PDB file of C-alpha atoms in Angstrom:
ATOM      1  CA  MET A   1     189.537 288.181  93.391  1.00 35.32           C
ATOM      2  CA  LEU A   2     187.367 288.993  90.382  1.00 36.65           C
ATOM      3  CA  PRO A   3     183.579 288.799  89.903  1.00 39.11           C
ATOM      4  CA  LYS A   4     182.017 286.949  86.977  1.00 34.67           C
ATOM      5  CA  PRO A   5     181.407 288.992  83.787  1.00 34.05           C
ATOM      6  CA  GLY A   6     178.282 291.138  83.348  1.00 34.20           C
ATOM      7  CA  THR A   7     176.612 289.027  80.636  1.00 34.25           C
ATOM      8  CA  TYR A   8     174.144 291.019  78.481  1.00 36.68           C
ATOM      9  CA  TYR A   9     170.500 290.124  78.967  1.00 35.61           C
ATOM     10  CA  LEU A  10     167.603 291.945  77.443  1.00 37.83           C
ATOM     11  CA  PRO A  11     165.353 293.309  80.220  1.00 35.59           C
ATOM     12  CA  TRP A  12     162.364 291.201  79.169  1.00 37.52           C
ATOM     13  CA  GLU A  13     164.609 288.184  79.610  1.00 35.49           C
ATOM     14  CA  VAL A  14     165.301 289.279  83.219  1.00 32.37           C
ATOM     15  CA  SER A  15     161.553 290.098  83.659  1.00 35.23           C
ATOM     16  CA  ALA A  16     160.431 286.681  82.435  1.00 38.26           C
ATOM     17  CA  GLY A  17     162.693 284.930  85.006  1.00 40.70           C
ATOM     18  CA  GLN A  18     165.109 283.533  82.392  1.00 41.37           C
ATOM     19  CA  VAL A  19     168.290 284.445  84.284  1.00 39.82           C
ATOM     20  CA  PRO A  20     169.202 281.965  87.075  1.00 43.62           C
ATOM     21  CA  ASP A  21     169.437 283.209  90.688  1.00 43.99           C
ATOM     22  CA  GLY A  22     172.936 284.471  91.427  1.00 43.33           C
ATOM     23  CA  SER A  23     173.954 285.207  87.750  1.00 41.63           C
ATOM     24  CA  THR A  24     176.017 288.299  87.022  1.00 38.11           C
ATOM     25  CA  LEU A  25     174.461 290.416  84.274  1.00 39.13           C
ATOM     26  CA  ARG A  26     174.228 293.694  82.421  1.00 38.47           C
ATOM     27  CA  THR A  27     170.784 294.917  81.472  1.00 39.30           C
ATOM     28  CA  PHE A  28     169.169 298.204  80.490  1.00 40.43           C
ATOM     29  CA  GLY A  29     166.020 300.290  80.658  1.00 38.95           C
ATOM     30  CA  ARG A  30     164.443 303.642  81.364  1.00 39.58           C
ATOM     31  CA  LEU A  31     164.682 304.739  84.988  1.00 39.27           C
ATOM     32  CA  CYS A  32     161.073 305.057  86.113  1.00 40.90           C
ATOM     33  CA  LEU A  33     161.412 304.773  89.888  1.00 40.45           C
ATOM     34  CA  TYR A  34     164.018 305.941  92.400  1.00 42.35           C
ATOM     35  CA  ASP A  35     163.352 305.776  96.111  1.00 43.40           C
ATOM     36  CA  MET A  36     166.495 306.508  98.090  1.00 43.49           C
ATOM     37  CA  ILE A  37     165.095 305.523 101.516  1.00 41.89           C
ATOM     38  CA  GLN A  38     164.368 302.014 100.286  1.00 44.74           C
ATOM     39  CA  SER A  39     167.410 301.948  97.943  1.00 41.97           C
ATOM     40  CA  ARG A  40     165.175 300.877  95.041  1.00 39.93           C
ATOM     41  CA  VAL A  41     165.322 301.599  91.343  1.00 37.20           C
ATOM     42  CA  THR A  42     162.976 300.302  88.683  1.00 37.38           C
ATOM     43  CA  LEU A  43     164.163 300.110  85.055  1.00 39.42           C
ATOM     44  CA  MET A  44     161.475 299.784  82.354  1.00 37.02           C
ATOM     45  CA  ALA A  45     161.500 298.550  78.772  1.00 39.02           C
ATOM     46  CA  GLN A  46     158.867 298.002  76.067  1.00 39.88           C
ATOM     47  CA  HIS A  47     158.822 294.773  74.026  1.00 42.58           C
ATOM     48  CA  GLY A  48     156.075 293.524  71.705  1.00 45.73           C
ATOM     49  CA  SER A  49     153.986 294.813  73.150  1.00 46.61           C
ATOM     50  CA  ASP A  50     154.127 294.931  76.950  1.00 44.33           C
ATOM     51  CA  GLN A  51     156.025 296.873  79.593  1.00 43.43           C
ATOM     52  CA  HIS A  52     158.733 294.937  81.459  1.00 43.88           C
ATOM     53  CA  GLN A  53     160.171 295.762  84.872  1.00 43.26           C
ATOM     54  CA  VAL A  54     163.655 295.174  86.248  1.00 39.18           C
ATOM     55  CA  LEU A  55     163.950 295.661  90.043  1.00 42.15           C
ATOM     56  CA  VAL A  56     167.346 297.144  91.116  1.00 41.31           C
ATOM     57  CA  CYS A  57     168.838 297.607  94.614  1.00 38.85           C
ATOM     58  CA  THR A  58     171.104 300.647  94.760  1.00 37.14           C
ATOM     59  CA  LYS A  59     172.947 300.069  98.088  1.00 36.70           C
ATOM     60  CA  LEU A  60     176.399 299.643  96.520  1.00 36.27           C
ATOM     61  CA  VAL A  61     176.014 302.559  94.081  1.00 37.03           C
ATOM     62  CA  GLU A  62     174.997 305.162  96.701  1.00 34.10           C
ATOM     63  CA  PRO A  63     175.146 308.084  96.667  1.00 31.87           C
ATOM     64  CA  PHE A  64     173.102 307.650  93.493  1.00 35.31           C
ATOM     65  CA  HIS A  65     172.456 310.784  91.420  1.00 34.68           C
ATOM     66  CA  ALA A  66     169.291 309.866  89.547  1.00 36.12           C
ATOM     67  CA  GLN A  67     168.235 310.925  86.059  1.00 36.15           C
ATOM     68  CA  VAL A  68     164.633 309.611  86.369  1.00 37.90           C
ATOM     69  CA  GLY A  69     163.179 309.332  82.886  1.00 35.96           C
ATOM     70  CA  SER A  70     166.635 308.510  81.358  1.00 37.22           C
ATOM     71  CA  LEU A  71     168.082 305.257  79.966  1.00 34.41           C
ATOM     72  CA  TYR A  72     170.465 303.294  82.191  1.00 33.87           C
ATOM     73  CA  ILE A  73     172.659 300.216  82.003  1.00 34.32           C
ATOM     74  CA  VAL A  74     172.951 298.277  85.223  1.00 29.75           C
ATOM     75  CA  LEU A  75     175.729 295.802  86.036  1.00 29.65           C
ATOM     76  CA  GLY A  76     175.177 293.496  88.998  1.00 29.24           C
ATOM     77  CA  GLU A  77     174.006 290.151  90.443  1.00 25.69           C
ATOM     78  CA  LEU A  78     170.441 288.852  90.265  1.00 26.95           C
ATOM     79  CA  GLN A  79     168.912 287.734  93.555  1.00 26.23           C
ATOM     80  CA  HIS A  80     165.649 285.911  94.338  1.00 25.68           C
ATOM     81  CA  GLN A  81     163.588 287.548  97.064  1.00 25.91           C
ATOM     82  CA  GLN A  82     161.197 285.968  99.578  1.00 29.73           C
ATOM     83  CA  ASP A  83     158.868 286.551  98.033  1.00 32.78           C
ATOM     84  CA  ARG A  84     158.436 289.693  95.929  1.00 34.31           C
ATOM     85  CA  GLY A  85     160.419 290.130  92.685  1.00 32.69           C
ATOM     86  CA  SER A  86     163.971 289.068  91.815  1.00 33.56           C
ATOM     87  CA  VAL A  87     166.239 292.114  92.238  1.00 35.08           C
ATOM     88  CA  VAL A  88     169.501 293.098  90.568  1.00 37.12           C
ATOM     89  CA  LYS A  89     172.060 294.093  93.202  1.00 35.02           C
ATOM     90  CA  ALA A  90     173.845 296.861  91.233  1.00 33.74           C
ATOM     91  CA  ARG A  91     177.597 297.183  91.329  1.00 31.98           C
ATOM     92  CA  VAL A  92     177.445 299.787  88.482  1.00 32.52           C
ATOM     93  CA  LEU A  93     174.478 301.953  87.456  1.00 32.77           C
ATOM     94  CA  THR A  94     175.304 304.156  84.435  1.00 32.89           C
ATOM     95  CA  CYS A  95     173.154 306.859  82.753  1.00 30.96           C
ATOM     96  CA  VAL A  96     173.176 306.363  78.976  1.00 33.11           C
ATOM     97  CA  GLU A  97     170.547 308.861  77.677  1.00 29.98           C
ATOM     98  CA  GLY A  98     170.356 309.028  74.468  1.00 28.17           C
ATOM     99  CA  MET A  99     172.120 305.850  73.530  1.00 28.03           C
ATOM    100  CA  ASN A 100     170.833 304.235  70.309  1.00 28.46           C
ATOM    101  CA  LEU A 101     168.826 301.518  71.991  1.00 26.41           C
ATOM    102  CA  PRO A 102     167.969 299.462  68.927  1.00 28.98           C
ATOM    103  CA  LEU A 103     171.663 299.472  67.919  1.00 29.99           C
ATOM    104  CA  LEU A 104     172.649 298.239  71.381  1.00 31.45           C
ATOM    105  CA  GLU A 105     170.095 295.431  70.993  1.00 29.71           C
ATOM    106  CA  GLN A 106     171.447 294.479  67.602  1.00 31.09           C
ATOM    107  CA  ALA A 107     175.027 294.433  68.977  1.00 31.17           C
ATOM    108  CA  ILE A 108     173.917 292.131  71.779  1.00 29.89           C
ATOM    109  CA  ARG A 109     172.196 289.828  69.253  1.00 28.16           C
ATOM    110  CA  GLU A 110     175.238 289.775  66.940  1.00 25.21           C
ATOM    111  CA  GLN A 111     177.538 289.014  69.854  1.00 24.56           C
ATOM    112  CA  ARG A 112     175.366 286.051  70.937  1.00 23.72           C
ATOM    113  CA  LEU A 113     174.987 284.700  67.379  1.00 23.62           C
ATOM    114  CA  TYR A 114     178.787 284.860  66.837  1.00 21.64           C
ATOM    115  CA  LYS A 115     179.362 282.928  70.063  1.00 20.57           C
ATOM    116  CA  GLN A 116     176.821 280.308  68.951  1.00 20.69           C
ATOM    117  CA  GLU A 117     178.290 280.100  65.386  1.00 21.24           C
ATOM    118  CA  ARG A 118     181.893 279.610  66.558  1.00 21.30           C
TER     119      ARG A 118
ATOM    120  CA  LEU B   6     202.390 293.174  65.368  1.00 18.88           C
ATOM    121  CA  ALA B   7     199.172 295.026  66.275  1.00 20.00           C
ATOM    122  CA  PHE B   8     197.306 295.403  69.528  1.00 17.00           C
ATOM    123  CA  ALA B   9     194.837 292.594  68.823  1.00 13.07           C
ATOM    124  CA  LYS B  10     191.209 293.345  69.642  1.00 11.58           C
ATOM    125  CA  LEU B  11     189.915 290.217  71.387  1.00 13.88           C
ATOM    126  CA  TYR B  12     187.205 289.073  73.772  1.00 14.94           C
ATOM    127  CA  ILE B  13     188.493 288.918  77.362  1.00 15.38           C
ATOM    128  CA  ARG B  14     187.118 285.380  77.434  1.00 12.17           C
ATOM    129  CA  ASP B  15     189.599 284.351  74.674  1.00 13.46           C
ATOM    130  CA  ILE B  16     192.486 286.090  76.434  1.00 12.89           C
ATOM    131  CA  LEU B  17     191.711 284.128  79.594  1.00 16.09           C
ATOM    132  CA  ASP B  18     191.695 280.749  77.874  1.00 18.53           C
ATOM    133  CA  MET B  19     194.036 280.834  74.824  1.00 17.24           C
ATOM    134  CA  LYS B  20     196.823 278.284  75.184  1.00 19.67           C
ATOM    135  CA  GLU B  21     200.328 279.610  75.741  1.00 20.53           C
ATOM    136  CA  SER B  22     203.043 278.698  73.263  1.00 18.10           C
ATOM    137  CA  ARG B  23     205.613 276.445  74.852  1.00 16.07           C
ATOM    138  CA  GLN B  24     208.195 277.252  72.152  1.00 16.07           C
ATOM    139  CA  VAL B  25     207.829 281.021  72.567  1.00 15.24           C
ATOM    140  CA  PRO B  26     206.706 281.955  76.108  1.00 17.52           C
ATOM    141  CA  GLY B  27     204.541 285.056  76.423  1.00 18.42           C
ATOM    142  CA  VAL B  28     203.024 284.275  73.014  1.00 18.50           C
ATOM    143  CA  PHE B  29     199.463 282.890  73.155  1.00 17.51           C
ATOM    144  CA  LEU B  30     197.557 281.012  70.454  1.00 16.75           C
ATOM    145  CA  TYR B  31     194.154 281.524  68.991  1.00 17.59           C
ATOM    146  CA  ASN B  32     193.425 279.182  66.090  1.00 15.57           C
ATOM    147  CA  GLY B  33     197.152 279.031  65.206  1.00 19.32           C
ATOM    148  CA  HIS B  34     197.388 282.836  65.396  1.00 18.60           C
ATOM    149  CA  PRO B  35     200.263 284.027  67.613  1.00 20.02           C
ATOM    150  CA  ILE B  36     198.868 286.626  70.024  1.00 23.02           C
ATOM    151  CA  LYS B  37     200.941 288.822  72.318  1.00 23.41           C
ATOM    152  CA  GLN B  38     199.700 292.440  72.347  1.00 24.16           C
ATOM    153  CA  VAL B  39     195.955 293.021  72.963  1.00 23.92           C
ATOM    154  CA  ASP B  40     193.421 295.860  73.039  1.00 24.81           C
ATOM    155  CA  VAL B  41     190.574 295.554  75.527  1.00 25.10           C
ATOM    156  CA  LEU B  42     187.673 297.866  76.401  1.00 22.59           C
ATOM    157  CA  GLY B  43     185.362 297.365  79.393  1.00 24.26           C
ATOM    158  CA  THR B  44     183.900 298.446  82.702  1.00 22.51           C
ATOM    159  CA  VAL B  45     186.178 298.882  85.729  1.00 24.34           C
ATOM    160  CA  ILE B  46     184.847 296.554  88.403  1.00 28.18           C
ATOM    161  CA  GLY B  47     187.751 296.601  90.879  1.00 29.77           C
ATOM    162  CA  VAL B  48     190.597 298.934  91.801  1.00 31.21           C
ATOM    163  CA  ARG B  49     193.719 298.047  93.738  1.00 31.95           C
ATOM    164  CA  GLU B  50     196.515 300.553  94.225  1.00 36.84           C
ATOM    165  CA  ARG B  51     200.134 299.684  95.016  1.00 38.52           C
ATOM    166  CA  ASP B  52     203.209 301.945  95.087  1.00 40.91           C
ATOM    167  CA  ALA B  53     204.283 301.404  91.483  1.00 42.49           C
ATOM    168  CA  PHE B  54     201.018 300.378  89.785  1.00 41.73           C
ATOM    169  CA  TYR B  55     197.242 300.223  89.671  1.00 41.92           C
ATOM    170  CA  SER B  56     195.405 296.945  89.226  1.00 41.84           C
ATOM    171  CA  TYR B  57     192.125 297.502  87.339  1.00 41.70           C
ATOM    172  CA  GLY B  58     189.663 294.603  87.121  1.00 42.92           C
ATOM    173  CA  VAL B  59     188.131 294.991  83.631  1.00 43.45           C
ATOM    174  CA  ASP B  60     184.804 293.447  82.554  1.00 45.50           C
ATOM    175  CA  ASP B  61     183.948 293.380  78.782  1.00 44.04           C
ATOM    176  CA  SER B  62     180.760 291.219  79.159  1.00 45.31           C
ATOM    177  CA  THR B  63     182.651 288.075  78.083  1.00 45.22           C
ATOM    178  CA  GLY B  64     185.152 287.893  80.928  1.00 46.99           C
ATOM    179  CA  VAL B  65     186.912 289.773  83.683  1.00 46.09           C
ATOM    180  CA  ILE B  66     190.677 290.359  83.828  1.00 49.87           C
ATOM    181  CA  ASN B  67     193.129 292.439  85.872  1.00 47.16           C
ATOM    182  CA  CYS B  68     195.082 295.047  83.965  1.00 47.70           C
ATOM    183  CA  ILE B  69     198.300 296.184  85.655  1.00 47.27           C
ATOM    184  CA  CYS B  70     198.757 299.865  84.899  1.00 48.68           C
ATOM    185  CA  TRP B  71     202.138 301.295  85.967  1.00 49.52           C
ATOM    186  CA  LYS B  72     202.095 304.728  87.531  1.00 48.39           C
ATOM    187  CA  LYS B  73     203.820 307.570  85.655  1.00 48.96           C
ATOM    188  CA  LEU B  74     206.817 309.733  86.676  1.00 45.68           C
ATOM    189  CA  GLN B  94     200.502 324.872  85.919  1.00 48.60           C
ATOM    190  CA  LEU B  95     201.634 321.201  85.785  1.00 49.94           C
ATOM    191  CA  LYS B  96     200.874 320.798  89.510  1.00 47.72           C
ATOM    192  CA  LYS B  97     198.599 323.868  89.653  1.00 49.59           C
ATOM    193  CA  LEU B  98     196.385 323.757  86.550  1.00 49.34           C
ATOM    194  CA  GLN B  99     196.384 319.963  86.023  1.00 51.53           C
ATOM    195  CA  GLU B 100     197.711 317.747  88.850  1.00 52.56           C
ATOM    196  CA  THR B 101     195.162 318.591  91.579  1.00 51.43           C
ATOM    197  CA  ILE B 102     192.434 318.033  88.951  1.00 52.90           C
ATOM    198  CA  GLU B 103     194.076 314.755  87.831  1.00 52.30           C
ATOM    199  CA  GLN B 104     194.166 313.977  91.572  1.00 50.21           C
ATOM    200  CA  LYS B 105     190.381 313.585  91.786  1.00 49.64           C
ATOM    201  CA  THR B 106     189.455 312.412  88.281  1.00 51.07           C
ATOM    202  CA  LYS B 107     191.213 309.071  88.933  1.00 52.07           C
ATOM    203  CA  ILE B 108     189.743 305.897  87.437  1.00 49.32           C
ATOM    204  CA  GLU B 109     187.086 304.266  89.625  1.00 52.55           C
ATOM    205  CA  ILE B 110     184.604 301.381  89.686  1.00 50.12           C
ATOM    206  CA  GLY B 111     182.051 302.029  86.955  1.00 50.41           C
ATOM    207  CA  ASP B 112     184.346 303.883  84.541  1.00 46.01           C
ATOM    208  CA  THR B 113     185.001 302.601  81.034  1.00 43.62           C
ATOM    209  CA  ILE B 114     188.669 302.045  80.187  1.00 42.32           C
ATOM    210  CA  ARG B 115     190.752 301.028  77.185  1.00 45.78           C
ATOM    211  CA  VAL B 116     193.929 299.011  77.821  1.00 47.42           C
ATOM    212  CA  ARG B 117     196.565 298.221  75.210  1.00 48.68           C
ATOM    213  CA  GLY B 118     199.222 295.841  76.488  1.00 43.05           C
ATOM    214  CA  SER B 119     200.775 292.392  76.684  1.00 45.37           C
ATOM    215  CA  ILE B 120     199.213 289.189  78.069  1.00 44.47           C
ATOM    216  CA  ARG B 121     201.135 287.933  81.112  1.00 43.80           C
ATOM    217  CA  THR B 122     200.911 285.022  83.479  1.00 43.98           C
ATOM    218  CA  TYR B 123     201.755 285.759  87.083  1.00 40.54           C
ATOM    219  CA  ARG B 124     201.175 283.525  90.119  1.00 40.49           C
ATOM    220  CA  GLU B 125     198.951 281.173  88.071  1.00 41.50           C
ATOM    221  CA  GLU B 126     196.696 284.093  87.062  1.00 41.49           C
ATOM    222  CA  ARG B 127     196.409 285.666  83.673  1.00 43.46           C
ATOM    223  CA  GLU B 128     196.821 289.469  83.499  1.00 46.69           C
ATOM    224  CA  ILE B 129     197.361 292.277  81.039  1.00 46.34           C
ATOM    225  CA  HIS B 130     200.386 294.465  81.497  1.00 42.72           C
ATOM    226  CA  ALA B 131     199.438 297.822  80.073  1.00 41.57           C
ATOM    227  CA  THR B 132     201.572 299.745  77.588  1.00 39.70           C
ATOM    228  CA  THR B 133     198.763 302.357  77.468  1.00 42.09           C
ATOM    229  CA  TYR B 134     195.500 302.824  79.384  1.00 42.28           C
ATOM    230  CA  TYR B 135     192.887 305.555  79.614  1.00 39.77           C
ATOM    231  CA  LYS B 136     189.423 306.317  80.855  1.00 45.68           C
ATOM    232  CA  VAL B 137     186.997 306.421  77.956  1.00 46.32           C
ATOM    233  CA  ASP B 138     184.270 309.058  77.899  1.00 47.36           C
ATOM    234  CA  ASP B 139     181.376 307.054  76.430  1.00 50.93           C
ATOM    235  CA  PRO B 140     178.196 308.916  77.522  1.00 51.96           C
ATOM    236  CA  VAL B 141     175.789 307.315  74.997  1.00 52.14           C
ATOM    237  CA  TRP B 142     177.614 303.921  74.735  1.00 53.90           C
ATOM    238  CA  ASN B 143     178.811 304.767  71.247  1.00 53.34           C
ATOM    239  CA  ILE B 144     182.326 303.399  71.533  1.00 53.02           C
ATOM    240  CA  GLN B 145     181.254 300.287  73.371  1.00 57.56           C
ATOM    241  CA  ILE B 146     178.427 299.459  70.911  1.00 60.85           C
ATOM    242  CA  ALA B 147     180.853 299.938  68.025  1.00 59.43           C
ATOM    243  CA  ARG B 148     183.329 297.568  69.686  1.00 59.51           C
ATOM    244  CA  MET B 149     180.644 294.971  70.337  1.00 58.45           C
ATOM    245  CA  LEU B 150     179.616 295.158  66.650  1.00 53.35           C
ATOM    246  CA  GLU B 151     183.194 295.132  65.282  1.00 54.94           C
ATOM    247  CA  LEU B 152     184.622 292.111  67.169  1.00 53.89           C
ATOM    248  CA  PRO B 153     182.603 289.352  65.441  1.00 54.92           C
ATOM    249  CA  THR B 154     183.888 290.690  62.119  1.00 54.81           C
ATOM    250  CA  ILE B 155     187.579 290.685  63.093  1.00 55.31           C
ATOM    251  CA  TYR B 156     187.115 287.107  64.302  1.00 53.22           C
ATOM    252  CA  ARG B 157     185.411 286.066  61.038  1.00 54.33           C
ATOM    253  CA  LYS B 158     187.914 287.767  58.749  1.00 58.16           C
ATOM    254  CA  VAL B 159     191.136 287.179  60.701  1.00 57.08           C
ATOM    255  CA  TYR B 160     191.244 285.061  63.894  1.00 57.92           C
ATOM    256  CA  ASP B 161     188.835 282.294  62.808  1.00 58.90           C
ATOM    257  CA  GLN B 162     190.581 282.053  59.395  1.00 58.83           C
ATOM    258  CA  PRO B 163     193.616 279.764  59.085  1.00 58.76           C
ATOM    259  CA  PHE B 164     196.680 281.689  60.254  1.00 62.21           C
ATOM    260  CA  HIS B 165     198.089 282.987  56.933  1.00 65.09           C
TER     261      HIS B 165
END
């Protein structure tokens, strides 16, 4: 009984509403909010030239030991809310400070292009 | 002859050779032994083995990892509570098997990877397209 794979999406793709409700995804960003009482995390990423927010629900990854200010990769399912923002329901929330972010992003791009070229 | 580094998605859908069972085919390349890296997303324990659901961003597959067996004093009680869990990164080298209409990897070797800055996983993500272009997507021999 296996979940779908955590497909890589850039955070500004999640932000812009480009991932369908119910998709399973990996994304990334700097942890800028953790509120345990409301089980909420916000991940942030810059992209030419705005800030982009990814809302994360931490219920399944509690007890969560936050490194606020650090880079994370979240793995989970995206869910529409009625009617604030779409939230990622995390199944995995991993601290990756100091990953080489632009290299990650290139690896994601190369992976996608290869799939497309096949 | 090697442990072939492949996308989990290809492992899940490569056709099996009728002539030689347990051998699977990618573009005329005979594949048996594989090398996967991904996130543990499920854990099931039985008496003789662990079942680890592994997610590499292209697919999810169960890897059957057979249990083994100072030594009990220095190590074992520490081994005891450093067990693989959901969220860990693991590497699994083994054979592709079919069992009860499901495809699985039967591990020859498996270990938790320490990948604190995503170094190993980024390198794997970058390497795979190249192995496909140079080897798997090229006519077999």
